[PDB]
């Protein structure tokens, strides 16, 4: 159940010494990554977010103003051009404040939710790297909510709904929640931390979530709620984070015009459900042991043929299933039919369609799954509808499974 | 008509001094970018390309084995970690070969078409940076085809088909083709250079494409066909690129087992239709002067009420259209109906739905386009149905013109 072993077997990704801690996504692995984007983008529309894209490196003067430079200078990549030093972004927080700062905003623009699939780069030690779990180049499903102080409860409640909503799609139902409090090197007065810590504590209790206090483990700018999910091996994975930041928007001079026509600093809420999506794919690879659900499968259907008589019929089927929105390959190789079926069974292709002379003259197809489950002959349109339902619903279990 | 003024007016993007030549894509601009990605991915499916992803930095040693370091080392960014120098990738070619090298390849795996929306960073002088046309961080629609010598004539013909297929969607019909020959600073044998240059000219003749040679304007490793398009102002924009490479696969130790069971070095084709997608968005911005086709419009439909009586009926339509996959926004401000239409016309929204009490009872809408035309009262399901066809077909023309 090692993702590195399964990743090599299914041709999902690879890593090499020339880029330590950075992933070479192959076609099948990228399909999973992009399909996770589609699911996340589906939730961003449902929860009414904005998707933006910031630049990959910015001037060091920005990271000095946030205080990130004074704290994580060793963990950042630096580069220079025209006697100016730039940092490859390890976080999307300052980049989102820049977008919010363009054009005067009013209180009617809030709550303004801003998400991004930002690719970040942290200079982790090479000895600390392990597969997809600990990488240098990662992509966080970051988002920052700009809202007023009266809107904190409603925004955090929406974030908590999203944390459990997205985890339930993958089957993760056991979740442990912590609450990281102020550390010994922080910014912002005590009374700001007091109100921030109490805000997250109340929202956790109003959501009927039992939580423990991780004292001193919060970020230097905000206290955070940490969600830890458990896989089928009962292993704890810390993925979700929700923070309450009253300081960084002020340090970057973010302002909005309130109802009293007074300049006010907006509240910033950092949140990430999956965390590092590279790491989340590694968790899913081990959680399902390569048996990804149909909607996440790199190759959803393979249509083979027994002889060259059914070569035309398979091509007609591959075209039709593709137009229905199904990731389908056609295997017209010159091999034994038992050799083809085994290859795709090892590739964990959820469904494999076999076309003999009987299938062509009957207008049907024989279906077997990657589990050895044999479904027999089914009408072509019947199969298409069942795959469309299993993909739209993002169901975890297959047909007859 | 300058894309920077139109970009600021439509809230598409912005740039600042802290990131020279690097774009802050706002929400509406990023919607255009992603809609381009969807269109390109639709072409990748039709033309049967793979989509992969590579790391954003790699060891300087890898960039030295290709000669990329020798040619443009002043155009690269460099960063260091644990006494190892890494270069932020300005090209996606080395990353794809590393993916190709992983795993044993035979002749049966060719042609291997591998595409990527790679984020590149070139260290351009700040005096040359202009808007979106000249940037430091750009996203190319790169693709590399690994094929045998016999497959060259078909694979290059496939690229030429793709170039004219994609440009037809945007209405560009005046394409000017050049063939960049070898430069005086180059690598590879003369005999290899003549095979590649002659093959490109033959491929253009087979498609009945008039072209001129361009001496010395080719890459150090391959000759390339350069596609230049003309906008409605008759200005030449060089976007397309198809190169025939005999040099880099040999240098990066890429090989495939042939039919003779003897290892052979594959032929590489570098393909790029749109080029820099930030630059393409800028060209489209000036070509349409902000009147993006409905399939690219950040906000396709705006629904407005004449008074507070129609507030609820407007919201039902906003939800009904949103479920139909249309980018619909509701305008419920307390402003005269003429003021709303004038504002959203300046925002170049394709369609504007006005809802009076006559519309609430009849269940219909009043359609007004950004061109000042009036389409009268139409059934809501009829408006949705025709709007969907205009998007799925990526039609340049709007309704009733
Ligand atoms: Zn953040
Ligand atoms: Zn290339």
Numbering used by the authors:
A (entry chain B), B (entry chain A): 242 to 642
The study reports:
Here, we report that a critical glycine residue (Gly463) dominates the motion of threonyl-tRNA synthetase (ThrRS) and the sensitivity of the enzyme to antibiotics. Our previous work showed that OB covalently binds to ThrRS, forming an ester bond with a tyrosine residue in the catalytic center via the highly strained β-lactone ring, making OB the first covalent aaRS inhibitor with demonstrated crystal structures.
In the apo state EcThrRS_G463S structure, the sidechain of the highly conserved residue Gln484 in the catalytic pocket forms a hydrogen bond with Tyr462, while in the OB-bound structure of the wild type (open state), the conformation of Gln484 is changed to accommodate OB. The distance between Ser463 and the conformation-altered Gln484 is only 1.6 Å. To test the possibility that Ser463 might become resistant to OB by blocking the conformational change of Gln484, we designed a G463S_Q484A mutant to remove the sidechain of Gln484 to avoid potential spatial conflicts. However, in the TSA experiment, OB increased the Tm of EcThrRS_G463S_Q484A by 17.2 °C, 10 °C less than the effect of 36j, suggesting that the EcThrRS_G463S_Q484A mutant, similar to EcThrRS_G463S, could still not be covalently inhibited by OB. Consistently, cocrystallizing 300 μM EcThrRS_G463S_Q484A protein with 600 μM OB did not yield an EcThrRS_G463S_Q484A–OB complex structure. The EcThrRS_G463S_Q484A structure is still in an apo state.
